[PDB]
Amino acid sequence: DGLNGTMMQYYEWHLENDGQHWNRLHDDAAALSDAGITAIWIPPAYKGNSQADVGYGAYDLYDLGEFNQKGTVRTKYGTKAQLERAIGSLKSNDINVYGDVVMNHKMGADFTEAVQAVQVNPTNRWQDISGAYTIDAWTGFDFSGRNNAYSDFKWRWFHFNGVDWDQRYQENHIFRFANTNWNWRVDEENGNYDYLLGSNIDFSHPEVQDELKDWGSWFTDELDLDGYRLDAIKHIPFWYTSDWVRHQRNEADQDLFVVGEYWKDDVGALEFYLDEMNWEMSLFDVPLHYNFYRASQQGGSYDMRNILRGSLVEAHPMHAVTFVDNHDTQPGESLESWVADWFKPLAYATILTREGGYPNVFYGDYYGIPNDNISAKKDMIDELLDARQNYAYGTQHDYFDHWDVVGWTREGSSSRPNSGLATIMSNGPGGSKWMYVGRQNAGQTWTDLTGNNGASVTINGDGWGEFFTNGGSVSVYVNQ
Ligand code: NA
Ligand code: NA
DSSP, X not given: OOOOOOEEEOOOTTOOOSXXXXXXXXXXXXXXXXXXXXXXXXXXXXXXXXXXXXXXXXXXXXXXXXXXXXXXXXXXXXXXXXXXXXXXXXXXXXXXXXXXXXXXXXXXXXXXXXXXXXXXXXXXXXXXXXXXXXEEEEEEBOOGGGTTSSOOOOBOXXXXXXXXXXXXXXXXXXXXXXXXXXXXXXXXXXXXXXXXXXXXXXXXXXXXXXXXXXXHHHHHHHHTOXXXXXXXXXXXXXXXXXXXXXXXXXXXXXXXXXXXXXXXXXXXXXHHHHHHHTTOSEXXXXXXXXXXXXXXXXXXXXXXXXXXXXXXXXXXXXXEEOBSOOTTTSTTSTTOOOOOTTXXXXXHHHHHHSSSSOOEEEHHHHSOBGGGTXXXXXXXXXXXXXXXXXXXXXXXXXXXXXXXXXXXXXXXXXXXXXXXXXXXXXXXXXXXXXXXXXXXXXXXXXXXXXXXOOOEEEOOTTSEEEEEEOTTEEEEEEOO
């Protein structure tokens, strides 16, 4: 063992709705493992509001593309049988499977129900702006085509506490069901950020807490998951997520890795949440993503010495899942903040070659995003994955000492031959920098894995070497 861990989000928002994705994953297993991928984060695998739903408009958590509901049997990605077949391929190829879990809300309700509600202030859900009146809310779920397979639980309006659409008078408003409280504790942006979209689940009810725990365990056992990616957890009561997590680890024999999506460009907020979780999971390093974006947007003037500053990985590398972009940050999406092609290579070297953090590769970057004419960066990434997989080991030395050129090295480890590397980059004019790589690598000649620089670096007697990088580029030297 000892091999570094590399996660990969296997999907992008504009993937084709051809129902063959699971099959593609199945066929890609061997190649992904060989490339350096050790864990695959799959998109929500259950029936959404429609066949083409990316998965977040979650309709039925027990329908993994097995029953005819919402106008389709399969999900956008494929059928339950093809999913299971894919997971089998992943497992036999030494790849962990983390399932995306959406429990904040539900959508695609089978029918509406009359509910007493009040409109609240969009920027302050604490502030009611209307008196209580009766609206028709899409809260009724009967899961017709499933026939109570796996579970006979049915959802009704009293399991929720809000919606953003009154079907009686057909109007958009943030509604809080009268005589129900907004979950707590939850992110406080907008006062109370319990409500995001769809029909918001109220976890105050015991029957709801238990249902999602049982489902969580059913799902876990059904797919033999090795962990989860928790969707929109800042909108879900902190106390419940912890309960749920502890419950799953209790029911499952296998270990379970957990990464939560707490979307906020504020590391303090993330640390607070992790505090409440008692550090029993990691979170996506959202501030680091925005640092990459801020740098991508600004240009060379951006001071590279601050690239990791304010990042979650900087403070708690053991609890940070680092990434460059995702299905929400890609162009045109809800959390759009795309890292341009010029800077993206630097961002990836940063999360794949450094020692801290559990790095995640984005499918959209790897294979490209045809919808927006974004080329596949597979070539560039595979060289960084080769570096991480075979060379990013041993003691690390940082050099964020210049506004343009920065770098770091890894001395390597006896446990893994020829390991050791020196990453150097610049977001402006090129340059060079002497860096220590371990007197034990002395007399060695290192070359750039990325091919961005032809310089051949020989390590002197004191274990030092001068490394070169061109402008707006990044190079990763290793003893190959
Ligand atoms: Na919520
Ligand atoms: Na700069």
